[PDB]
Design a protein around this ligand. Structure first.
Ligand SMILES: *[C@@H]1O[C@H](CO)[C@@H](O[C@@H]2O[C@H](CO)[C@@H](O[C@@H]3O[C@H](CO)[C@@H](O)[C@H](O)[C@@H]3O)[C@H](O)[C@H]2NC(C)=O)[C@H](O)[C@H]1NC(C)=O
Ligand SMILES: *[C@@H]1O[C@H](CO)[C@@H](O[C@@H]2O[C@H](CO)[C@@H](O[C@@H]3O[C@H](CO)[C@@H](O)[C@H](O)[C@@H]3O)[C@H](O)[C@H]2NC(C)=O)[C@H](O)[C@H]1NC(C)=O
Ligand SMILES: *[C@@H]1O[C@H](CO)[C@@H](O[C@@H]2O[C@H](CO)[C@@H](O[C@@H]3O[C@H](CO)[C@@H](O)[C@H](O)[C@@H]3O)[C@H](O)[C@H]2NC(C)=O)[C@H](O)[C@H]1NC(C)=O
Ligand SMILES: *[C@@H]1O[C@H](CO)[C@@H](O[C@@H]2O[C@H](CO)[C@@H](O[C@@H]3O[C@H](CO)[C@@H](O)[C@H](O)[C@@H]3O)[C@H](O)[C@H]2NC(C)=O)[C@H](O)[C@H]1NC(C)=O
Ligand SMILES: *[C@@H]1O[C@H](CO)[C@@H](O[C@@H]2O[C@H](CO)[C@@H](O)[C@H](O)[C@H]2NC(C)=O)[C@H](O)[C@H]1NC(C)=O
Ligand SMILES: *[C@@H]1O[C@H](CO)[C@@H](O[C@@H]2O[C@H](CO)[C@@H](O)[C@H](O)[C@H]2NC(C)=O)[C@H](O)[C@H]1NC(C)=O
Ligand SMILES: *[C@@H]1O[C@H](CO)[C@@H](O)[C@H](O)[C@H]1NC(C)=O
Ligand SMILES: *[C@@H]1O[C@H](CO)[C@@H](O)[C@H](O)[C@H]1NC(C)=O
Ligand SMILES: *[C@@H]1O[C@H](CO)[C@@H](O)[C@H](O)[C@H]1NC(C)=O
Ligand SMILES: *[C@@H]1O[C@H](CO)[C@@H](O)[C@H](O)[C@H]1NC(C)=O
Ligand SMILES: *[C@@H]1O[C@H](CO)[C@@H](O)[C@H](O)[C@H]1NC(C)=O
Lengths: 362, 366, 243, 196
């Protein structure tokens, strides 16, 4: 409850990230799933064409959150080797047959997700549609249609997306959200999985046409190239440092100053020093013997009304000896001075045994 | 935050580590202060540089440059060449302040001799001061005044050679460079240790948390904590071991400043090789440099010597010196410089008879 | 036959730019001064094991070396442009790419592709930009298949030799990286080509080995020199001291 | 605050012991930090996995304490060695070493025992009340230069004397206070005067 005069390291300052920057490369090469579900023409159930795709950005969220479907019997956070996206039309109650039925045993056999949509809008020909061919048994005779049909007899354009988890690397990765880029502000940066904290700025380094990252001798990442745009950005460490409190001692006063080691006073009587930022101490042009060492030649003291002052400590009086080639100074008196020197000699002899300390009669 | 809760289970291992490091940091300021804050006042050399023929221009501060740093100090500084919670604190005494202390110590020695280190600075002509130093190594003071021009030239040439040795070769300051390298790699090794699994699935906590549920992610995190905590322990222990080593070196530099710079040392090989005369401190990065001015005898020649001589049935011994012979005549000379002179009753003392001393000779005393 | 891979087979292991440092990489490299196998384009297009990746040099004029078969897989650097296709190709026992040697065109124009006969199970396909049809340059290639991720490196560097690898230094900038995810246990070389005189093109095979290899990145992030950890004691001490 | 060094040693040791005892209340990932609680709640198969976590925790903390003591004992020994040296050549004799026995010209020292340490009372001679005089390296008398055998030539302004070095006790320059060496032609700063 009482602290003696001095400098004390209380806590640790660290600029909390105003934002967590995440910069996935611009979402391009959109997967052709946009046109699979409403292609100009679809094949028969038995003639289901495989639209296997690789290295495409399949946006399942827009498809899943479309409000223009019939059954989503299953996504953008998962990447897969390929998507065996089928394409066909089934008659009403056959939708339930597409699940892990006439269609389920003759035309299709599901061992992914299933998407269905009202086919009466486009595929249903007016006056009788027979373009599709139906395998009644497993045998292709006809399908049959009527525009004035109900729901169980109504066709449904169904595309069956079957995700693959083969040993081959996943290639159909869904879109990943990205933040914006803000410079000159501590923010957590994650462009392509390289998450970290640092102030983001424009750098002078030139990257190789292929290189994306940059690292220091200690293997730490220092500069990055934005995947969305070819800008070389230097990632400096996010501002942080210790917080130490100058106190002249409770026995003297309760006023204190706070030092933020290694900061510019912009991230926090505010005085900028080579040792950090001083708050609560007023800079004085005078120089005295060091009382409390702030650092970098700066010391803080309590003096007269009273306050804490920060000053550049003085090394002593600026004496100049009256030297000349033919003058000598010779003492005419003397003084007998008895000074003190204190040296530690020994410590306390402490003995400790494990079994008592570690376990204890156990 | 998931880890920070886990790390609390280890208690106060980290209040200990910070206490150990802050204890080291406070010591480093004490080391520098003890070595350099050896002068009560900031003595200044006079504008007139009539030092009997000695020019200390290469060791005195040069106000032309911003740092007001000596010429040789500049050579020393050139020769010697905030990532993951790691901060380097600035020393309490700036390089400019250290260079001011050496200037004060240097200015005091030139103008006062050893007096300023034992009280008030008492001026004395440098040539007369060097006479004290010669007298303090067993050589009479007339040899300095008679050879003042030669001795001054020898000092200037010797100081000139130190410039070439430092400027030409960058390997002279190995001791100071080694300290910098050891600290630099200690931090690099500590930082590089963050990239090791220590047995966990990965060295990145985000990956561990992302790819595992808290139960089986907690065990993986604990492996990282123990390894990273252990690596932080070895760093502090090494620093404590090194800090003790540097403190011993700093304690030695402090003693050398007191005994070599603030006075004349009779201790052999302490302040350079030979007979100590003077020492001049110079400031170097994270260290100090001493220019030990030493008196080396040279061009010896053989002589025939006796312990005493018989004059009138009584043995004469030299008051301070040696008995030497030309092969035909006998003289008495000081030990460290051949200055023969007539053997008289004023530079010898009589004690006893002639038949107790082995090697007695039969010369005459005038 | 065999020759010496003096200071070749060095590329950029990763997508990292580092300035004025010396980086040590335990990677799949070509040992210095190694007895690299020597074939001649007499025509030599045998099947060789694709064990732990493989290097490939080509003193290529008129685009002699036009493809390679791994796995079924191909990287057909045809005349038009690079074409990497992943399918269950029914590769011929003697696969190659046919070229009409100035058959009245006063130019070696590619007109045939006997690399494979048909494709059944296609998984991937990539097509790159075109390039000049041209020797005075040592085109070199490296091929790796790790964790399914299939990597390709190459560089276009001028040289002034005829049939031996020059004693210079060059770094193969990566050009392609694909997730074909197939099993590659063997490979073969497809070259320019009934009745032929294969164009003079010294093409080499160097079975890369996993080895530490110290790289010197200049201030521009482009590799300027390198050494090994097993070439000799001198190299070993350099790598230990990182200098 | 005079006995800071002695108190610091006591404070450092007590602080180290306190942290060692405080470490006994840590869990180290175990269900409880009390060994009895684990034993009285779990069967041996599941108690070992918990007791083992404590053992590594207690053991590591104890090892950290011991190594810190070893390093701390090394500097205390260095201080005891220095104190032993001072007693030897500062109390038991007069030392020429500068600042080894306080600021000034050492005269004598006295030891005083202190808790876990020693205190030296360094008696030193510090000159005071200096005065300016003009001085010369030597004096030419009869074409021969005279030097102070043990002294320095000083001038009141009109007369030349020979004081000792560091206490103004002027004496008449005689052939007993000075010795002759050569003629007054090679020493810079020679001043004419008479040698009684
Ligand atoms: C050398 O210095 C010492 C002191 O360090 C001088 O002795 C001091 O002399 C003064 C004046 O003679 C004394 O002051 C007087 O003290 C008496 C009491 O005895 C008082 O009644 C007077 O009114 C006056 O204040 C002083 O006490 C004395 N100090 C000591 C410790 O004895 C000494 O005179 C100096 N010598 C020379 C040659 O200058
Ligand atoms: C004590 O030593 C210092 C140097 O060790 C002397 O100062 C140097 O004196 C020399 C000769 O007078 C100077 O050389 C001249 O330098 C100028 C400028 O470069 C050049 O134009 C002239 O042709 C000549 O070479 C030198 O500059 C000067 N300073 C330094 C740093 O070397 C000093 O004079 C000596 N004290 C004495 C003689 O009392
Ligand atoms: C060792 O020292 C003694 C004394 O210094 C030497 O004896 C001296 O020898 C020199 C010449 O060798 C003599 O010089 C002569 O002096 C007379 C004056 O009396 C002068 O008239 C002559 O023209 C000549 O210059 C000197 O007198 C003589 N001293 C004495 C006392 O006899 C001795 O030679 C030395 N031995 C060596 C160097 O081996
Ligand atoms: C520096 O000190 C010397 C000391 O010798 C001064 O010279 C001499 O000083 C004494 C003491 O004042 C003089 O004695 C005088 O005696 C007469 C007759 O008894 C008396 O009336 C005077 O009041 C004085 O006491 C002495 O004559 C004088 N000269 C010699 C040759 O001894 C010298 O003056 C001092 N200089 C300065 C600048 O202080
Ligand atoms: C030094 O001189 C003394 C006397 O001048 C020598 O002593 C004499 O020695 C001779 C023969 O050795 C004797 O006959 C005398 O009786 C001695 N006299 C005395 C008074 O002792 C001595 O020998 C000389 N020493 C040398 C080395 O020549
Ligand atoms: C010390 O005295 C000597 C002589 O006693 C001085 O030297 C003489 O000076 C005069 C006039 O300056 C000359 O005429 C003589 O030739 C010099 N030599 C001799 C042997 O007399 C000398 O100058 C005096 N020193 C001082 C500082 O006054
Ligand atoms: C596209 O698909 C939607 C289903 O979401 C369908 O309603 C529409 O008719 C299709 N074609 C066009 C041009 O929108
Ligand atoms: C930040 O601190 C550095 C270090 O002194 C300084 O050079 C720079 O100008 C400061 N920037 C701001 C905005 O205060
Ligand atoms: C002294 O004499 C010895 C042998 O006579 C010789 O070796 C030595 O060099 C001589 N000393 C000097 C200084 O000449
Ligand atoms: C000194 O030793 C030599 C050795 O030959 C001997 O001849 C001589 O007599 C000795 N003299 C004395 C005084 O011991
Ligand atoms: C001392 O300095 C003054 C002025 O600089 C000069 O006149 C005098 O000759 C010098 N003395 C000696 C002995 O050089």
């Amino acid at each position: 409850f009482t602290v003696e005069k001095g400098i004390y390291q209380t806590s640790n300052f660290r600029v909390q990230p105003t934002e967590s920057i995440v910069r996935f490369p611009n979402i391009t090469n959109l997967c052709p799933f946009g046109e699979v579900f409403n292609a100009t023409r679809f094949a028969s159930v038995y003639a289901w064409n495989r639209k296997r795709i690789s290295n495409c950005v399949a946006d399942y969220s827009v498809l899943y959150n479309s409000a223009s479907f019939s059954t989503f019997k299953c996504l953008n956070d998962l990447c897969f080797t390929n998507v065996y996206a089928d394409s066909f039309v089934i008659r009403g109650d056959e939708v339930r047959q597409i699940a892990p039925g006439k269609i389920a045993d003759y035309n299709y056999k599901l061992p992914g997700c299933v998407i269905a949509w009202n086919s009466n809008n486009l595929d249903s020909k007016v006056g009788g549609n027979y373009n599709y061919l139906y395998r009644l048994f497993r045998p292709l005779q006809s399908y049959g249609f009527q525009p004035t049909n109900g729901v169980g007899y109504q066709p449904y354009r169904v595309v069956v997306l079957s995700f693959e988890l083969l040993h081959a690397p996943a290639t159909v990765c869904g879109p990943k959200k990205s933040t914006n880029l803000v410079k000159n502000k501590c923010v957590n940066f994650n462009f392509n999985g390289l998450t970290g904290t640092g102030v983001l700025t424009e750098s002078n380094k030139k990257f190789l046409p292929f290189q994306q990252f940059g690292r220091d001798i200690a293997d730490t990442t220092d500069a990055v190239r934005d995947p969305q745009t070819l800008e070389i950005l230097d990632i400096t460490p996010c501002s942080f440092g210790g917080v130490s409190v100058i106190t002249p001692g409770t026995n003297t006063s309760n006023q204190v100053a706070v030092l933020y080691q290694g900061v510019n006073c912009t991230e926090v009587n505010v005085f900028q020093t080579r040792a950090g930022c001083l708050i609560g101490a007023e800079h004085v042009n005078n120089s005295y013997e060091c009382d409390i060492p702030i650092g970098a030649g700066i010391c803080a003291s309590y003096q007269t009304s009273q306050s804490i002052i920060a000053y550049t400590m003085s090394l002593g009086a600026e004496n100049s000896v009256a030297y000349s080639n033919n003058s000598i100074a010779i003492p005419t008196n003397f003084t007998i001075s008895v000074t003190t020197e204190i040296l530690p000699v020994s410590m306390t002899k402490t003995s400790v045994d494990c079994t008592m300390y570690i376990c204890g009669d156990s | 935050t998931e880890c920070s809760n886990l790390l609390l289970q280890y208690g106060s291992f980290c209040t200990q580590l910070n206490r150990a490091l802050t204890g080291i940091a406070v010591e480093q300021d004490k080391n520098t202060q003890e070595v350099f804050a050896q002068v009560k006042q900031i003595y200044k050399t006079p504008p007139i540089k009539d030092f009997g023929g000695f020019n200390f221009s290469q060791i005195l501060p040069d106000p032309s440059k911003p740092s007001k740093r000596s010429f040789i100090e500049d050579l020393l500084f050139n020769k010697v060449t905030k990532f993951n919670g790691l901060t380097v604190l600035p020393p309490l005494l700036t390089d400019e302040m250290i260079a001011q202390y050496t200037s004060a110590l240097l200015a005091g020695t030139i103008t006062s001799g050893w007096t300023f280190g034992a009280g008030a600075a008492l001026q004395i002509p440098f040539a007369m001061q060097m006479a004290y130093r010669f007298n303090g190594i067993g050589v009479t003071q007339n040899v300095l005044y008679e050879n003042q021009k030669l001795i001054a030239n020898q000092f200037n040439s010797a100081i000139g050679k130190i410039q070439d040795s430092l400027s030409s070769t960058a390997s002279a300051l190995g001791k100071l460079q080694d300290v910098v390298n050891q600290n630099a790699q200690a931090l690099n090794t500590l930082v590089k240790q963050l990239s090791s699994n220590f047995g966990a699935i990965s060295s990145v906590l985000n990956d561990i948390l992302s790819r595992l549920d808290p139960p089986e992610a907690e065990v993986q995190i604990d492996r990282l904590i123990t390894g990273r905590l252990q690596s932080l322990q070895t760093y502090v222990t090494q620093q404590l071991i090194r800090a003790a080593e540097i403190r011993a070196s700093a304690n030695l530099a402090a003693t050398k400043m007191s005994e070599c710079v603030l006075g004349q040392s009779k201790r052999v090989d302490f302040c350079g090789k030979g007979y100590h005369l003077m020492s001049f401190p110079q400031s170097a990065p994270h260290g100090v440099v001493f220019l030990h001015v030493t008196y080396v005898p040279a061009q010896e020649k053989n002589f025939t010597t006796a312990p005493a001589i018989c004059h009138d049935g009584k043995a004469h011994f030299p008051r301070e010196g040696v008995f030497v012979s030309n092969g035909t005549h006998w003289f008495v000379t000081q030990r460290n410089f051949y200055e023969p002179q007539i053997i008289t009753t004023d530079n010898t003392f009589v004690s006893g008879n002639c038949d107790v001393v082995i090697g007695i000779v039969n010369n005459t005393v005038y | 036959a065999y020759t010496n891979s003096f200071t070749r087979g060095v590329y950029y292991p990763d997508k990292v730019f580092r300035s004025s440092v010396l980086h040590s990489t335990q990677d799949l490299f070509l040992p210095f001064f190694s007895n690299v196998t020597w074939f001649h384009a007499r025509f030599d297009n045998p099947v060789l094991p694709f064990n732990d990746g493989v290097y490939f040099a080509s003193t290529e004029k008129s685009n002699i070396i036009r493809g390679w078969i791994f796995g079924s897989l191909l990287i057909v650097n045809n005349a038009t442009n690079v074409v990497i296709k992943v399918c269950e190709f029914q590769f011929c026992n003697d696969p190659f790419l046919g070229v009409y040697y100035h058959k009245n065109n006063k130019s070696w124009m590619e007109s045939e592709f006997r690399v494979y006969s048909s494709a059944n199970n296609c998984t991937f396909e990539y097509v790159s930009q075109p390039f000049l049809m041209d020797f005075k340059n040592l085109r070199e290639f490296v091929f790796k298949n790790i964790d399914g991720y299939f990597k390709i490196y190459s560089k276009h560097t001028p040289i002034n030799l005829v049939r031996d690898l020059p004693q210079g230094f060059s770094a193969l900038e990566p050009l392609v990286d694909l997730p074909i995810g197939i099993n590659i246990t063997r490979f073969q070389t497809l070259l320019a080509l009934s009745g032929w005189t294969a164009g003079a093109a010294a093409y080499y095979v160097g079975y890369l080995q996993p080895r530490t290899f110290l790289l010197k990145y200049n201030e521009n992030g482009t590799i300027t020199d390198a050494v090994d950890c097993a070439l000799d004691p001198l190299s070993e001490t350099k790598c230990t001291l990182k200098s």
